Amino acid sequence: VGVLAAQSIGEPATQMKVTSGVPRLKEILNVAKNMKTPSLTVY
Amino acid sequence: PQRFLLPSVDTATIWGVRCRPGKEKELIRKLLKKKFNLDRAMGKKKLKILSIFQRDNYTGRIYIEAPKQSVIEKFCNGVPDIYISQKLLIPVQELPLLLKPNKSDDVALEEGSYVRIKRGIYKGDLAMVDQISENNLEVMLKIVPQLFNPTMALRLDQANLYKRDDRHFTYKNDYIDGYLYKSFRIQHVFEPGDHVTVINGEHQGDAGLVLMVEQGQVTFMSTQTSREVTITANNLSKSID
Amino acid sequence: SERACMLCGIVQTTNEFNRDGCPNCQGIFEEAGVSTMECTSPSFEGLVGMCKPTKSWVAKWLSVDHSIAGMYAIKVDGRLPAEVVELLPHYKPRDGSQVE
Amino acid sequence: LRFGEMERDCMIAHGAASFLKERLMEASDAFRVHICGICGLMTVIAKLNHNQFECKGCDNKIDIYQIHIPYAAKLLFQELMAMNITPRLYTDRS
Amino acid sequence: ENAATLQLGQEFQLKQINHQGEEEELIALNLSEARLVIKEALVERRRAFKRSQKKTREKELESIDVLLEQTTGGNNKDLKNTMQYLTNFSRFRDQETVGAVIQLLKSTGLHPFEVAQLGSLACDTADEAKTLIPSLNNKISDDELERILKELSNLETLY
Amino acid sequence: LRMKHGTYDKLDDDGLIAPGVRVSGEDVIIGKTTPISSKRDASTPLRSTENGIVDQVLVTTNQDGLKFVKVRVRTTKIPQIGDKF
Amino acid sequence: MFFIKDLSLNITLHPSFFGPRMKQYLKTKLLEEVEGSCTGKFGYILCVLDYDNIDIQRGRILPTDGSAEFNVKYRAVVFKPFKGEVVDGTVVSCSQHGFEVQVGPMKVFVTKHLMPQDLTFNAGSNPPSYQSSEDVITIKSRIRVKIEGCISQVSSIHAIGSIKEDYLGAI
Amino acid sequence: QQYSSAPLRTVKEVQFGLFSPEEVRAISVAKIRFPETMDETQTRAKIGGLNDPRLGSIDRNLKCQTCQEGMNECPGHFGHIDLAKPVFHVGFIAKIKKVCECVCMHCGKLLLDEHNELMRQALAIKDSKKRFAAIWTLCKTKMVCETDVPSEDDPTQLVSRGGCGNTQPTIRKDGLKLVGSWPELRVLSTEEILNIFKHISVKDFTSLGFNEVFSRPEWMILTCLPVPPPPVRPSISFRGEDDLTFKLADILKANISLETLEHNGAPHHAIEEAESLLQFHVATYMDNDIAGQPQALQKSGRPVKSIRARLKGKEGRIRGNLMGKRVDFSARTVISGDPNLELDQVGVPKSIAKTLTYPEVVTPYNIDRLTQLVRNGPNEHPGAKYVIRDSGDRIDLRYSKRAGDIQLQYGWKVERHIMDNDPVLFNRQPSLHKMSMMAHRVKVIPYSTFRLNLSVTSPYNADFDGDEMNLHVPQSEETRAELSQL
Amino acid sequence: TKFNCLFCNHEKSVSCTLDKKNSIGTLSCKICGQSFQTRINSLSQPVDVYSDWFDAVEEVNSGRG
Amino acid sequence: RCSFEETVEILFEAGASAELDDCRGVSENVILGQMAPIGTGAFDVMIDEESLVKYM
DNA sequence: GCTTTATTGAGGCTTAAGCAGTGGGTTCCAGGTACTAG
DNA sequence: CTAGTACCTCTTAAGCCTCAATAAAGC
Ligand SMILES: [Mg+2]
Ligand SMILES: [Zn+2]
Ligand SMILES: [Zn+2]
Ligand SMILES: [Zn+2]
Ligand SMILES: [Zn+2]
């Protein structure tokens, strides 16, 4: 299961205002204490 | 007399300075020449440098005897291949051993002893010390030239062959009994049933079981030969079964 | 070639010894009736540049306090002639034999 | 050809453990090494012609087991031993 | 180090493991019981071979030798030597005698090795028994030791 | 003692294949032997994956005067399915 | 020393010999292995009992090889001498340094220095024997001796004993 | 590849304890004391030195004395070096500093005890790493050992802990040799640190995380450097000893010089320089790249390669020869589209099919087919090139002129050329996802380009613009079944 | 707070304390016990105090005060 | 963890701590060249001595 | 009331990490220097 | 004389040490 999940999460990254795309995935995977484009949503 | 030569803080003060290996003698000579030139030029004002020396076995360092560090730093300033910054104070207790001559690895030469020639066309050839000069500067060595054959010498180079005695022949300027004598510089020259194994001797590598021990001689039955062999205890090692 | 005297340890070229001999032991050699070459050896270890023999502890350690400033050898191999030894009751060889 | 790490994990995902074992132990470098059952070290004296097995480190006569591993594995183990690191290969779970 | 002071090895513990993982007490046997179990094993082997193939110091020794030759014969010559050693100087010839001996030794509750030695080795005096096994000195009362020794001596078969 | 699968028959007496000689596989192009102290072969085998007719051979002297050899081999390659355009 | 215990043996079988009679071959190989075995760890194996009740665990198939590895657990009786024990044997040969005594599957040697003073070797009889003031020793004799040392061989066990305490020797 | 009587069984666990000097001496069959790797005339290896025959066979045609084996079966043996002066381990230098800070510099006892509540809380941590970190933090917080500690129940009353009272210096980490400050800064002797480690009791380093059975704080201070056997230091033909052999020779020369200096009068001045040089050489041998220190330069124009470098990254053994290693039975070449091929069917060049082989075992079912393949010979595509007998020896067919006279027997194996309907794994090097490596049925074609179905291009992300793909042929029935079914 | 000294010719035996509140630089040696004081600024550094001390020593030695 | 970016530091840490590896991971078996407990290798295949007789 | 504490945290410097696979062409057999064998 | 032979030469994640306030205990 782990290897399948890793491959399924990595394939879109290879295929590919607010940071998005590969930089966002790298930030999410890393601890990312400092946020390049921090955001908050309130309703 | 040497008891009164013990170094003291108020009498001996030597500082070590790092230098490039292989330039110790040249650096010492250059420093001595510079000191002489400074003494000749400046005149009354002379740097307080008492001696500069080095040790062959201790490469990459020189030693200067001065009363103050600043004097050494000024004297050595601008001298290539000397790291004045990388300097340390030599403790007094270490001063004697620093100047103590190194124990030469050459064993005391004795008549009939076997040695190996370091320099010469017979490199790697065993030699026998026959005689030692009174000045202890040259030693006579007997070596194998294959043994000298008077017949072949007479057949080939009789012009350079001379006979001094029934067993003495001179060839190309001294062969005795087929061996060449030449002068060389000294600097150029247990319990029963225990498993035991032979580590040294004629039976080296043999293993067996001890049966009797007496007066330091251990007798063991050897499986390889199935016979009792008696060997000195020091030449046997107890092997764990 | 450079040779170091077996008596005082001074190191000098063979030409200097042949021409002028040892500046510090010429008289002793002449008294002993021996040549300078026989009292000098080509094998030596270590080099010492003595500048103030009278005020240098190294000179006292090497027994060259009364000698002149110059190049000396810490260790010199060989033995002096028997005549020189007889004239120097307190002679100490520089080969390290008496440094036990 | 080189069996890349990405290919290795792709095969792992495929679940073909037998294929990976064959590829990394049969189609590639293959070695057979002897290890004691007490010290678990590859330094075992094994004379196959004499059929004599003995390890000097531990006083054991017949406690040796043979394992098939890649030559790279034993090279790594020896390199670690050079670093005073001893991978103790054991055939049983404690 | 292994000696007679009950300092057994790392494997000769007082407790033993079973095929099912249960822990039992170590059990020993004497020469007569050893011969009985060996004979039973030989009979079982002979029966197994037969079914598979289907689809006074002068006569007993010959029968034992021929039985050994028929099954597990020729593989090693040490088995015959061990069998001869066991048979030549055995003590009990009847199953009932060995059964009674083991039943009596069970009541003592001593170490299996000690009871095996007592049932195998022969002793006649308390001092001889004590010096034979110094470790088992302050474990068995003198009266009990004498009683068991005389019982064993009486139980000896007359060949 | 060191002999390779390369066929030395193509080599002439001089040790160099002349132009117009068919060479393939590990066939030796230059025959060189280094004396050992009697000698060990040091020939330059042809590329295993490439083959063709030797086009030219030249022999000269290097800067230090040592003998030097250069052999150019020519092959005709026709378009195939795997070729890239 | 005559101890019954459970021993586990691993036996490898080729996949070809997977017929109905494979059990017979496995049992034959087990008999050929256990009999004559002599290892210092487990001592000397004497016999294996309950042949018909031998249970064989499910075989293990190698990850790549087709061989099957069966771990068979069997109850067996084994013999292992210990230091300080007293055992009886029969003299097998005589020598100047002593006489070897066969006991069970093992041999025992008595040191000359640890022999009675009265006992003395004699070559006047064929074969050479030993004479004592109150005992007689020959090739065919039952001798009870104490074992003081044990030596383990690749496939043999040796004992070193002595006869100094009373009630020892010929009986 | 020789028969062995040792039982066969895979490894199930791997302990990673330290290698004790006593174990080194016990297992080190030979002793290395000659820096020269060869004897006079460069014919026989130096006895009791580098490349000694006892460690292994330097070159073919000679059998290792220890094992009487050549190159195929020769794991190698290590040698023990005296190393009179202990040398800090580069990898454990931080561990050495932490242990020294955690224990007294005189009594070799843990600075704190169970009396302190914080120490008890730290010990409560089951994890070795976190517990050791907490203990180190608490110890560095303390600055002086106390012989008597206040009692928690009675703060006024104190209980004698058994300490001395010596202050704990602030140990620094500068260069190979650490310096401690009490303030006066001084270099702590390696012998003193080794003695302190030896004085550590079982409980102390057991709490610190060192397993007594397989590790000890003293064992970190290496007093003997194992000598890798010849296989670890192959001689490259140009003998051409590797850089590691040169580093070992330099270390041995340094040790010999240090021993000679010690035996020929030790002024203690140059002894420090010799010891520092030996430590630097050992550290470079174990780790050439040392942060904030000069890198040892090999005699040639290249930095010396060390074991740490050899196990650094992709080029290292871990990621270069274990996680990913080269394969024998495999081919690589360009791919071309082919609408006339089935989805699971992949075209294969005839030459690649001939080169690639499968070891099919001889059976009565296909005895005739295998005999026909053998008769065809390696040159003909439907044939074979090698025949494996029962003994395991392999006989080639092209070199043997009597191939047609060979009668196959049951149990033998023949390396037959891959035929049609033969599963093989087709892959593209950028294995981005799981579906980048799939099994295809071989279809032999008379062209030098792999051919695959049009659809399978999408999972492979292929575009036939020069893409090169790899085909791996299974070499066993197990592998074939797994590829076909999984 | 480590600097060389000229009276005892010992390195790293000198310590300098800079009181910016009082703007005073005090240099003291731990071996010969020599103490010197000078005026300093907020931008002053121990090297400045050492240079001032050396200049004062030179002036005293020259006798041109 | 050795197979990751940190290679020799983890080895030194394990040596200092004498860490024990159960070899249940993929990397351990891959390095040892043994069938990992993965899919096909997760379980083991045995032989039934009672079903074989009746199947014959 | 004043003095000395353990704690808190906050940044500088540091040591690490840095797609996969494949094909090929160039260059290193290191510079000078002293000592010694034919 | 001449030529061998060896020999000295760009973007973050954690660790640690070093810094400036702060509430309690000594006294
Ligand atoms: Mg493309
Ligand atoms: Zn072992
Ligand atoms: Zn070997
Ligand atoms: Zn203490
Ligand atoms: Zn001062």
CATH number at residue G130: 2.40.50.140
Phi then psi dihedrals of residue G145, to 5 deg: -135, 155
**Residue of H7, H10, H411 lying closest to G10 (CB–CB):** H7
Nearest to H12 by CA among J1, D65, A2, D56: D65
Q: Provide the token pair at H229.
A: 């056997």
Distance CA G151, CA G40 (A): 9
H338 and H478, same domain (yes or no): yes
Distance CA H98, CA H208 (A): 10
H185 and H95, same domain (yes or no): yes
Nearest to H179 by CA among H91, H258, H84, H88: H88
I32 is in an annotated binding site: yes
Residues 6+ apart with CB under 8 A from H456: H343, H426, H438, H440, H462
Judging by beta carbons within 10 Å of its beta carbon (0-12, 13-18, 19+), is residue H368 exposed, middle or buried?
Answer: exposed
Angle between helices D17-25 and D5-14 (to 10 degrees): 150
Number of domains present in the structure of chain H: 4
For residue E101, give its domain range. Answer: 29-53+56-159
Displacement of CA J11 from its chain's centroid (Å): 19
Nucleotides, chain K, CB distance < 7 Å = 6-7, 14-24, 29-30, 36-38
In this structure, the strands spanning D64-69 and D31-36 are antiparallel
Nearest to H122 by CA among H141, H109, H135: H135
For residue H82, give its domain range. Answer: 3-86+245-286
* Cβ within 8 Å, pair D61-G152: yes
H249 and H276, same domain (yes or no): yes
Is residue D65 domain-resident?
yes
E70 and E20, same domain (yes or no): no
G24 CB neighbour count, 10 Å cutoff: 13
H434 and H382, same domain (yes or no): no
Q: Provide the token pair at B34.
A: 């510079």
**Residue of G97, G113, G151 lying closest to B241 (CB–CB):** G151
In this structure, the strands spanning B207-214 and B217-222 are antiparallel
Gyration radius from chain G CA atoms:
22
Contact at 8 Å (CB) between F62 and F74? no
H264 and H375, same domain (yes or no): no
How far is ligand 3, taken at its centre, from the CA of residue H232, in Å?
12
Domain boundary among G39, G61, G84: G84
In one-letter notation, the amino acid at residue H119 is M
Displacement of CA D54 from its chain's centroid (Å): 18
Distance CA H299, CA H293 (A): 19
Question: Do the chains G and B touch each other, judged by at least 3 C-beta pairs below 8 angstroms?
Answer: yes
* Cβ within 8 Å, pair H336-F80: no
In this structure, the strands spanning G157-162 and G106-110 are parallel
Distance CA H77, CA J38 (A): 35
Q: Is the dihedral of CA C21, C26, C29, C30 positive or negative?
A: positive
Q: Mutating which of D6, D8, D9 best tests the A interface, going by the most A Cβ atoms within 10 A?
A: D9
G80 and G123, same domain (yes or no): no
Number of domains present in the structure of chain G: 2
- Nearest 5°: CA angle at B69, between B68 and B72? 100
- In order, the DSSP letters of C25-62 are THHHHHHHT--TGGGEES-EE-EEEES-GGG-HHHHHT
G89 and G56, same domain (yes or no): no
Distance CA H211, CA J17 (A): 7
C79 CB neighbour count, 10 Å cutoff: 18
Distance CA C15, CA C21 (A): 9
D-chain CB neighbours of G39 within 8 Å are 62
What are the Cα distances from residue H251, in Å, to D79, E85, G86, H205?
Answer: 17, 64, 58, 31
Distance CA B115, CA I28 (A): 64
* Ligand in closest contact with the CA of I35: 5
Q: Please give the nucleotide, over all strands, whose C1' is closest to the CA of residue H97.
A: L16
G44 and G94, same domain (yes or no): no
A-chain CB neighbours of D13 within 8 Å are 3-4, 7
Contact at 8 Å (CB) between H417 and H384? yes
Is residue H206 domain-resident?
yes
Question: Do the chains B and I touch each other, judged by at least 3 C-beta pairs below 8 angstroms?
Answer: yes
Q: Mutating which of H13, H22, H220 best tests the D interface, going by the most D Cβ atoms within 10 A?
A: H13
D-chain CB neighbours of A3 within 8 Å are 9, 12-13
H362 and H395, same domain (yes or no): yes
Q: What is the 3-state secondary structure (H, E, C) of chain H?
A: CCCCCCCECCCCEEEEEECCHHHHHHHCCEECCECCCCCHHHCCCCCCECCCCCCCCCCCCCCCCCCCCCCCCCCCCCEECCCCCCECCCCCHHHHHHHHHHECCCCCCECCCCCCHHHHHHHCCCCHHHHHHHHHHHHHHCCECCCEEECCCCCCCEEECCCCCCECCEECCCCCCCEEECCCEEECCHHHHHHHHHHCCHHHHHHHCCCCCCCCHHHHCECCCCECCHHHCCCECCCECCHHHHHHHHHHHHHHHHHHHHHCCCCCCHHHHHHHHHHHHHHHHHCCCCCCCCCCECCCCCECCCHHHHCCCCCCHHHHHHCCEECCCEEEEEEEECCCCCCCEEEEEHHHHHHCEEEEECCHHHHHHHHHHHHHCCCCCCCEEEEECCCCCEEECCCCCCHHHCCCCCCCEEEEECCCCCEEEEEECCCCCHHHEEEEEEEEECCCCEEECCCCHHHHCCCCCCCEEEEECCCCHHHHHHHHHC
For residue G161, give its domain range. Answer: 85-171
Judging by beta carbons within 10 Å of its beta carbon (0-12, 13-18, 19+), is residue D80 exposed, middle or buried?
Answer: buried
H225 and H280, same domain (yes or no): no
G60 and G138, same domain (yes or no): no
Phi then psi dihedrals of residue J19, to 5 deg: -65, 145
**Quick check: B118 CB within 7 A of strand L?**
no
Distance CA E74, CA E79 (A): 9
Number of domains present in the structure of chain E: 2
Is residue D93 domain-resident?
no
Contact at 8 Å (CB) between D91 and H11? yes
Distance CA G69, CA J45 (A): 11
Domain boundary among G47, G64, G84: G84
In one-letter notation, the amino acid at residue C49 is G
Distance CA H227, CA H224 (A): 9
**How many Cα atoms within 13 Å fall on the side-chain side of residue H16?**
21
E8 and E77, same domain (yes or no): no
**Residue of H13, H311, H322 lying closest to J20 (CB–CB):** H13
G46 and G89, same domain (yes or no): no
In one-letter notation, the amino acid at residue H170 is T
Q: Please give the nucleotide, over all strands, whose C1' is closest to the CA of residue H298.
A: L9
Q: Is the dihedral of CA D67, D72, D73, D77 positive or negative?
A: positive
Is residue H312 domain-resident?
no
Nucleotides, chain L, CB distance < 7 Å = 8-9, 12-14, 16-18
Structure method? cryo-EM
**Quick check: H238 CB within 7 A of strand K?**
yes
E83 and E142, same domain (yes or no): yes
Angle between helices H128-141 and J8-17 (to 10 degrees): 80
- In order, the DSSP letters of B77-132 are TT-TTEEEEEEEEPPGGGHHHHHSPP--SSPPP-TT-EEE-SSSTTTT-EEEEEEE
Contact at 8 Å (CB) between H262 and H282? no
The domain spanning residue D54 has which CATH number? 3.90.1800.10
Nearest to G98 by CA among E135, H426, B192: B192
Q: Is J23 on the interface with D (CB under 8 A)?
A: no
SS3 category, G136: strand
- Work out how many CB contacts closer than 8 A connect G with H: 8
SS3 category, B207: strand
Q: Please give the nucleotide, over all strands, whose C1' is closest to the CA of residue H155.
A: L25
* Cβ within 8 Å, pair G12-H476: no
E34 and E22, same domain (yes or no): no
Is residue D64 domain-resident?
yes
Is residue H304 domain-resident?
no
**Quick check: B67 CB within 7 A of strand L?**
no
E88 and E13, same domain (yes or no): no
In this structure, the strands spanning C70-72 and H179-181 are unpaired
Q: Provide the token pair at G123.
A: 């070559």
E20 and E92, same domain (yes or no): no
Distance to chain D for A37, nearest Cα, Å: 32
G140 and G165, same domain (yes or no): yes
What are the Cα distances from residue H153, in Å, to H115, H119, H156, H157?
Answer: 10, 16, 9, 9
Distance CA H175, CA H187 (A): 11
H30 and H103, same domain (yes or no): no
Resolution of the structure in the document, Å: 2.8
For residue D24, give its domain range. Answer: 1-85
Is residue D91 domain-resident?
no
B-chain CB neighbours of C62 within 8 Å are 99
**How many Cα atoms within 13 Å fall on the side-chain side of residue H303?**
14
**Quick check: H141 CB within 7 A of strand K?**
yes
H126 and H216, same domain (yes or no): yes
The domain spanning residue G58 has which CATH number? 3.30.1490.120
Distance CA F61, CA H474 (A): 53
Distance CA H263, CA H256 (A): 10
Distance CA G82, CA G106 (A): 13
Q: Is the dihedral of CA F6, F10, F13, F17 positive or negative?
A: negative
How far is ligand 1, taken at its centre, from the CA of residue H314, in Å?
26
Residues 6+ apart with CB under 8 A from G74: G6, G7, G9, G30, G34, G48, G50, G54
Nearest CA in chain I to B88: I11
G74 and G103, same domain (yes or no): no
Distance CA H426, CA H473 (A): 9
Q: Is the dihedral of CA H87, H90, H92, H93 positive or negative?
A: positive
In one-letter notation, the amino acid at residue C77 is D
Strand partners, B219: B212, B230
Helix residue ranges, H only, B106-221:
150-157
- In order, the DSSP letters of F7-64 are --TTS-SSSBPPTT-EE-TT-EEE--EEE---EEE--EEPPTT--EEEEEEEEEE-TT
- Nearest 5°: CA angle at G78, between G76 and G84? 155
SS3 category, E84: helix
**DSSP state, residue I60:** H
Phi then psi dihedrals of residue H269, to 5 deg: -90, -60
Q: Is it true that the peptide bond before G127 is cis, omega within 30 degrees of 0?
A: yes
C-chain CB neighbours of B29 within 8 Å are 47, 49, 71
D36 is in an annotated binding site: yes
Number of domains present in the structure of chain D: 1
E150 and E102, same domain (yes or no): yes
Residues 328-367 on chain H lying near strand L, CB distance under 7 A: none
Q: Please give the nucleotide, over all strands, whose C1' is closest to the CA of residue H429.
A: K21
H142 and H191, same domain (yes or no): yes
- Nearest 5°: CA angle at H413, between H412 and H416? 145
- Nearest 5°: CA angle at B56, between B54 and B59? 80
C93 CB neighbour count, 10 Å cutoff: 18
H139 and H222, same domain (yes or no): yes
SS3 category, F6: coil
Q: Please give the nucleotide, over all strands, whose C1' is closest to the CA of residue H326.
A: K21
Contact at 8 Å (CB) between H362 and H370? yes
How far is ligand 2, taken at its centre, from the CA of residue D30, in Å?
22
Task: Let me know how long chain H is.
Answer: 486
What are the Cα distances from residue H194, in Å, to H19, H108, H178, H287?
Answer: 16, 10, 14, 22
H482 CB neighbour count, 10 Å cutoff: 24
**Quick check: J9 CB within 7 A of strand K?**
yes
Distance CA H306, CA H416 (A): 44
The domain spanning residue H36 has which CATH number? 4.10.860.120
Phi then psi dihedrals of residue H317, to 5 deg: -65, -40
Q: Which helix (H) or strand (E) holds E149?
A: helix E142-155
H45 CB neighbour count, 10 Å cutoff: 24
Is residue H106 domain-resident?
yes
In one-letter notation, the amino acid at residue B168 is H
**How many Cα atoms within 13 Å fall on the side-chain side of residue B101?**
21
Displacement of CA D90 from its chain's centroid (Å): 10
Strand partners, G73: G8, G55
Is residue H313 domain-resident?
no
H370 and H401, same domain (yes or no): yes
Q: Could you tell me if residue D21 is left (phi over 0), alpha (psi between -120 and 50 degrees) or otherwise beta?
A: alpha
Distance CA I16, CA I13 (A): 10
SS3 category, D74: helix
Strand partners, H149: H159
**DSSP state, residue J39:** G
Q: Which residues have a C–N gap over 2.5 Å right after them in chain A?
A: 16
List all residues of chain H from 225 to 284 with a beta carbon under 8 Å from chain B: 260-261, 264-270, 273
CA dihedral F72, F76, F79, F83 (to 10 degrees): -20
